[PDB]
Design an enzyme around this catalytic site. Structure first.
Site, PDB file in Angstrom:
ATOM      1  N   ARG A 190      -1.312   9.132  -6.226  1.00  9.77           N
ATOM      2  CA  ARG A 190      -0.312   7.946  -7.048  1.00  9.77           C
ATOM      3  C   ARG A 190      -1.363   7.632  -8.531  1.00  9.77           C
ATOM      4  O   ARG A 190      -0.768   6.250  -8.571  1.00  9.77           O
ATOM      5  CB  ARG A 190      -0.721   6.861  -6.149  1.00  9.77           C
ATOM      6  CG  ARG A 190       0.835   7.173  -5.185  1.00  9.77           C
ATOM      7  CD  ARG A 190       0.731   6.126  -4.100  1.00  9.77           C
ATOM      8  NE  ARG A 190      -0.560   6.606  -2.994  1.00  9.77           N
ATOM      9  CZ  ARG A 190      -1.748   6.133  -2.000  1.00  9.77           C
ATOM     10  NH1 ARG A 190      -0.550   5.069  -1.923  1.00  9.77           N
ATOM     11  NH2 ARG A 190      -2.223   6.306  -1.299  1.00  9.77           N
ATOM     12  N   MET A 191      -2.474   8.814  -8.602  1.00  5.42           N
ATOM     13  CA  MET A 191      -3.855   7.927 -10.024  1.00  5.42           C
ATOM     14  C   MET A 191      -2.509   9.155 -11.138  1.00  5.42           C
ATOM     15  O   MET A 191      -2.674   8.345 -12.524  1.00  5.42           O
ATOM     16  CB  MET A 191      -4.563   8.523 -10.077  1.00  5.42           C
ATOM     17  CG  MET A 191      -5.477   7.698  -8.820  1.00  5.42           C
ATOM     18  SD  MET A 191      -6.125   6.309  -9.099  1.00  5.42           S
ATOM     19  CE  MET A 191      -6.994   6.351 -10.477  1.00  5.42           C
TER      20      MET A 191
END
EC number: 2.7.7.23
Lengths: 327, 327, 327
Positions: free
Chosen positions: B16-17
């Site tokens: 999710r980065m």
């Protein structure tokens, strides 16, 4: 309204400021805290403004040289009651004596005027606020509604130690009366010092009435002992000024990123972008647009001028329709 | 205190980065998250610091080359329990083993020291926090006060699925003990993976005591899975640093518009205006004034210097009483 | 879905804006409020977009010249019901008529689409929100769940004057139906004006169903009457855009100090420092780094470029791997 003088208490050491500059001279929006209080006193009409100080006499006298103040030294740090006693000899018996603090900078003239209106003949006008967490703050004692006195936290009993209404410490009463109560203060206390808050009971016992008033904003009575507290009050004030400007028709692109440290005069449809700082006296004509990050100081900017981002405009009078910067 | 090593878990994928840079290398105040954890480990005295990683081995080794770390690969993403098993072979039986996360950057040395003090002989020291909304977070099981285990949310029953005390996932225990429990973990779970949280029950059953401790701040145990979460922690940290500086006597004209990404050394009565950024090691002498928007990086600024707005001061040693800029 | 037209109500005087520019032309993130509403209408597929205006006709026509709008004048300020009557003659009997406000800029297409899905055959689709403090806001009357009407605060009884669900004023229904109800409105009211909110009861009495829907965010239905309110909505929008960007993988060093006034196209691992402003259409290639305080406007910035602090990049296409500024 009756003649009145003001006592400004600035006797604390300001140890938690960790500074060589007297605490009350530290600035809020470019003006020393005490100067804010001194201006509110003058706006009210104070016949005299007594300034009671602990050390830093020279720096204070030097910094406040443009004001006509009666300097009252408090040789030792014996508290507000003791401090008021040092000023008492200068109170007229005809006038009301209002007492304020050099480190409660945002107290408004409007509020002090109502405090002055609510003071009963022969009585006291007390300013108080409703705070849920009186821990530390002195509690207001009442009997069937009417104020009876103030009980210092350390002197408050578990039972009363949970009264919500708090003493802001700001009050007003006749000078002769004040001189009388002040003479009857004692040290057989929690800390062998005279309690100025005692005058409330002393006046109740004399059968005189003490009326309590509240400020429009809690910020008006917040005091400053350290820099974290000053910054917090700075933000509240900036925020309040920004809101007034927007409601008055000035478009601030982000009121949380705007700082007014002086006096702004403006026309219609002015636009101020983010991170702008206004200092000293500044006039912005109609439809002026201030780009992001500009610093405008002691300048007049003509109608329709546009100032590009990150421009510093100082001691300048700029002709109308100007185009300052590359963009 | 006893010798101790540290295990830093940095095995997640960091999907999710949405980045090509390994999640734990993303910076918080200029320093990679994992570096913050590695520095806290070193400050505690870790004899060894085991770093457990999923992919990005090369980038990690490259980025953390100046540290003496024992690189532990976790071939597949089988969870923290499985990850701890990969490091276990390196634990000494004499030392305590503290386990931390590469993406919980703000954990403080002070807190970890109390966690180390509360660990009972032969037992576990558990760090936990009171959160009203345990949804997702593992719940702490207790019997007559004492800790009994941890029940993973997906494995928690409606009844227990509303326990408030949460498992931060940070804990400490003897190495031999740890090696024993780790060997007894199983997959007949909600998701066929070893639960590191199981060691709590395993240790309770062995009749050993597990003491729970709490951090000074909730921020200390917040983890980061995406950039919105990192920014939030960045703000909390900046805010905390700003408050310490103001309480320490540095005047920040707006603590919400200040960023310290390094180490600040300062003297007395320093003034820092809005939007200033401090990077690397910076020293500001007495009474230095930093105008709005300056960027001061790896520089030393002499007493009484004044830096005009929007100045970038880099790799500079500036002589006392300097006047930098037009204003 | 069925053909549909839109009515945009922009008839108010905008007195509290204290401006010479028609209230609905004031910008939110660089685009006039009404333009935001007009774009949402077009995105929905409005066959026609009727714009109902009080004064400022010329300025409005001048400003919205690039749109194909049916200008509907409302000679006098007789309220929304009266305003809708002026547009009614243009409604087709085949289409649905959606009514929106030129000063409720953040209403989303997504929400309006669900409002369109929830409209029952022959009925009305009503958008409402749960607000604890209906003071001033019109209240939603229900009977066994189903909507019955709306009672204007001044016309609400003490009893009903404490219903929580509020009328956002946004609704959709068939044109023929709308024409019918609009014809049956009356002035024997609290203020001799036609109440558009009346059509709800009129439709209930005709035995038709009115379904209520809610927006994802309360901000979507906030209206603007003064500049303090516009700034507040500006902040909410900026904050929402910043969060989406961070979740999408763009590193904003402080989402509270970022402003997007246009359209941002970006690649992977872009870093944007504090106080940056993005205007018009901007594209930032992969790994671009934007220093603090830059203003990027209608420009394309190549992969790997680095822009130094406080740079203004305008109408520029910058070659990849560029190094713009001193730093």
């Amino acid at each position: 309204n009756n003649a009145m003088s003001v006592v400004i208490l600035a006797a604390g050491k300001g140890t938690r400021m960790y500074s060589d500059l007297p605490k009350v001279l530290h600035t809020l929006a470019g003006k020393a805290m005490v100067q804010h209080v001194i201006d509110a006193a003058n706006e009210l009409g104070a016949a005299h403004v007594h300034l009671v100080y602990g050390h830093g006499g020279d720096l204070l006298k030097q910094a406040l040289k443009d004001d006509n103040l009666n300097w009252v030294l408090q040789a030792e740090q014996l508290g507000t009651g003791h401090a008021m006693q040092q000023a008492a000899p200068f109170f007229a018996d005809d006038e009301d004596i209002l007492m304020l603090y050099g480190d409660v900078p945002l107290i408004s003239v409007e509020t002090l005027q109502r405090l002055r209106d609510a003071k009963p003949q022969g009585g006291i006008g007390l300013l108080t606020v409703k705070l849920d967490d009186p821990t530390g703050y002195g509690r207001i004692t009442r009997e069937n509604g009417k104020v009876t006195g103030i009980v210092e936290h350390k002197d408050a009993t578990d039972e009363q130690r949970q009264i919500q209404e708090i003493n802001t410490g700001i009050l007003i009463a006749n000078g002769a009366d004040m001189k009388r109560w002040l003479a009857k203060l004692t040290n057989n206390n929690a800390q062998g010092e005279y309690y100025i808050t005692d005058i409330i009971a002393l006046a109740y016992q004399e059968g005189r009435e003490i009326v309590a008033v509240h400020p429009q904003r809690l910020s008006e009575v917040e005091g400053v002992n350290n820099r974290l507290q000053l910054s917090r009050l700075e933000r509240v004030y900036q925020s309040e000024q920004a809101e007034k400007l927007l409601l008055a028709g000035v478009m601030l692109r982000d009121p949380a990123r705007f700082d007014l440290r002086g006096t702004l005069t403006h026309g219609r449809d002015v636009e101020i972008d983010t991170n702008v700082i206004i200092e000293g006296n500044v006039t912005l004509g109609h439809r002026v647009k201030i780009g992001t990050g500009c610093v405008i100081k002691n300048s007049v900017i003509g109608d329709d001028c546009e100032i590009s981002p990150y421009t510093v405009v100082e001691d300048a009078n700029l002709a109308a329709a100007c185009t300052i910067g590359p963009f």
